[PDB]
């Protein structure tokens, strides 16, 4: 007759939630080497033939784990840095005066703020000054008798504590690899046209994944990776108007951004080993910061995006873009991080459906120093200046679009820039794989009987 | 696009009767009780689930694209217009008389 036989090491698994290890290759950058182990050298990928697995990018746990880890690491990376509490004092901010061709637009952005703060002794004060950008200055008790005596403060210094970033922290988005713990493994979908949700029929087992760059941006996705075969649109239900549309490009667009000013830096001491950095003066003339996007590459990219979006909806609809509907600055404009400088670039020249003949689109940008990155959660960070002009270059590899509501008796669909939820950017990379729990113990009938 | 229909335009019943209101849609639906007052009250969500605080008189079933909103043991308190919604689209409801 048939008897029960126990098999240990059976290649079966179930869906599970667990904690993954960080790994990276070889001043201490936030994340990475300070708290990570070595990567798996010469890693292998094992193709599982005749296996179909249901992957949902949206419900993946790895996104929440990455979000939590990044927030925690950032907070620690700011924990030992100089706090700016002693600088939340009355400021007197007047027009900055320069000797060389300052444009009338910049006279309203760079303010010369004089203030009385502490020095490195408990019983003495200093009278100092610094140049600040207008978005970081809040007005109090405007003096209508002598406008130069109006009071100002650093933005939100009355609400929370502003901490200056340590100058020795490396803010480069170094890719971090996620390794499964023992007993668990990561399954990856190798179906080049996978929508991000559904029964992937070409899968492989990965002990530890490739690295993902923790790039922070809004409206557009930067760096990361390109689609292998075509532009892919991922969006939960797709017809639900509160769900982001993620456009994963197969071809990048090069963008060059810059702060052309010298911004000569001054260092002022506040306390016993607590120092503050701020712009001292500017040598030369003053220009706005800006980004340069190639005209023809952008026009081709939008043509292809419109075609692929049209393929995912009713054929009797025109696809058009429109400028962002507004909201906080972090989502109204495109957010960068180039060597610690936070740029807020006006993208209304890219999404206005204006096929501008310009060879290079140029977008004006604002630069802000007091940044609350995680939608208001966390310590406010003060980004110190860097003397000299700054240039940077990056690849635009995707878009975050939001559908412009909906109605009947309409023959066109309008998409606008969106984003602001950092998890979506992290999904645009983590979507390729999910984590499984090995269940090696199985039973089956056979003719195996004990001699006993 | 999501297409919808709603029928009847009006309903008249006696107290204690069991009545149905039909809405057709290719998408997720919910139902609300709209009174001449402060706000509509949500009755049914998902294919057929009841909200907390709703008396056990309201029910529903789906088959294909049709939903019936079966209302058992109709009471005087149930005189209202019953609205049917798919996402941002709300279809004018059936006015119940009694």
């Amino acid at each position: 007759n048939m008897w029960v036989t126990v098999y240990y090491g059976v290649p079966v698994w179930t869906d599970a939630k667990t904690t993954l290890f960080c790994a990276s290759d070889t001043v201490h950058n936030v994340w990475a080497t300070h708290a990570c182990v070595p990567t798996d050298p010469n890693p292998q990928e094992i193709v599982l033939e005749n296996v179909t697995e249901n992957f949902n990018m949206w419900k993946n746990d790895m996104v929440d784990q990455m979000h939590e880890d990044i927030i925690s690491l950032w907070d620690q990376s700011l924990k030992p840095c100089v706090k700016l509490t002693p600088l939340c004092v009355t400021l007197h901010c007047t027009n900055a005066t320069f000797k060389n061709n300052v444009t009338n637009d910049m006279n309203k952005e760079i303010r010369n703020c004089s203030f009385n703060t502490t020095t490195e002794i408990r019983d003495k004060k200093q009278q100092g000054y610094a140049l600040f950008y207008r978005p970081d200055i809040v007005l109090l008790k405007e003096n209508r008798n002598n406008s130069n005596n109006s009071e100002y403060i650093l933005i939100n210094c009355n609400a929370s504590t502003i901490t200056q970033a340590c100058p020795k922290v490396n803010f480069d988005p170094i890719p971090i690899h996620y390794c499964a713990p023992a007993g668990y493994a990561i399954l990856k979908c190798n179906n080049k046209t996978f929508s991000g949700k559904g029964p992937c029929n070409n899968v492989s087992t990965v002990q530890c994944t490739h690295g993902i760059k923790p790039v922070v941006s809004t409206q557009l996705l930067l760096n990361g990776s390109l689609a292998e075969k075509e532009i892919i649109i991922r969006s939960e239900n797709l017809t639900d108007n509160v769900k982001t549309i993620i456009v994963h490009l197969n071809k990048s667009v090069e963008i060059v951004c810059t702060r052309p000013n010298n911004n000569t830096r001054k260092s002022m001491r506040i306390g016993p080993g607590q120092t503050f950095y701020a712009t001292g003066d500017i040598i030369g003339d003053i220009r706005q910061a800006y980004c340069n996007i190639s005209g023809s590459k952008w026009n081709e990219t939008l043509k292809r995006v419109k075609e692929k979006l049209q393929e995912n909806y009713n054929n009797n609809k025109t696809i058009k873009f429109a400028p962002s509907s507004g909201g906080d600055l972090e989502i109204t404009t495109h957010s960068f991080n180039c060597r610690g400088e936070f740029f807020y670039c006006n993208t209304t020249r890219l999404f206005n459906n204006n096929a501008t003949e310009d060879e290079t689109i140029t977008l004006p940008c604002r630069i802000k120093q007091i940044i609350n990155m995680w939608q208001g959660v966390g310590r406010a960070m003060y980004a110190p200046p860097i003397a000299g002009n700054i240039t940077c270059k990056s690849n635009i590899t995707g878009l975050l679009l939001v559908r412009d509501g909906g109605e009947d008796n309409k023959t066109e669909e309008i998409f606008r820039p969106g984003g602001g939820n950092m998890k979506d950017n992290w999904r645009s990379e983590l979507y390729k794989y999910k984590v499984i729990e090995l269940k090696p113990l199985g039973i089956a009938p056979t003719g195996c009987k004990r001699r006993v | 696009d999501i297409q919808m229909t709603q029928s009847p335009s009006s309903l008249s019943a006696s107290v204690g009767d069991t009545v149905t209101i039909t809405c057709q849609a290719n998408g997720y639906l919910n139902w609300y009780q709209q009174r001449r007052g402060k706000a509509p009250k949500l009755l049914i969500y998902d294919g057929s689930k009841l909200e907390r605080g709703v008396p056990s008189r309201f029910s529903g079933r789906r088959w294909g694209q049709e939903y019936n909103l079966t209302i058992n043991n109709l009471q005087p308190e149930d005189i209202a217009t019953y609205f049917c919604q798919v996402y941002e689209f709300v279809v004018p409801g059936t006015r119940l008389d009694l």
Partner: nanobody, 121 residues
Framework: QVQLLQSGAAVTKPGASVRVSCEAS????????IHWWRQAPGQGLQWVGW????????????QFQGRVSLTRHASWDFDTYSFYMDLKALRSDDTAVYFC????????????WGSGTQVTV
């Protein structure tokens, strides 16, 4: 206890911008979208738009673009939020009751509604 309070009725003239407010309290506001609806007399409910309480992003349908500005102001410690609908190019056709509501699910299920602000033009 989830609560949405609204301002009282307002009467103005065509072309005069009108603000309708809704104050949310008693729950974690940051986790749910707030939607606005317009109910003209004798009609059904027209969708006006949604606002994300954490990012401030408005989303309005075509018929309200350039006319309706949705915003939000967070209070201290995020215990309450004040949401506003600013209607600019006001016309006599916009007489209606304006409602705020919470989206608690992926089905656009609106559990709690405000009292409704009557706007007459």
């Amino acid at each position: 206890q989830v609560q949405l309070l609204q301002s009282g009725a307002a009467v103005t003239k065509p072309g005069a911008s009108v603000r309708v407010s809704c104050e949310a309290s008693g729950y974690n506001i940051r986790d749910y979208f707030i939607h606005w609806w317009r109910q003209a007399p004798g009609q059904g409910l027209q969708w006006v738009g949604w606002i994300n309480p954490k990012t401030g992003q408005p989303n309005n349908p075509r018929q309200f673009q350039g006319r309706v500005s949705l915003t939000r102001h967070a209070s201290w410690d995020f215990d309450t939020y004040s949401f506003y609908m600013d209607l600019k190019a006001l016309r006599s056709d916009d007489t209606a009751v304006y409602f705020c509501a919470r989206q608690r699910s992926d089905y656009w299920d609106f559990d709690v509604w405000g009292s409704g602000t009557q706007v007459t033009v």
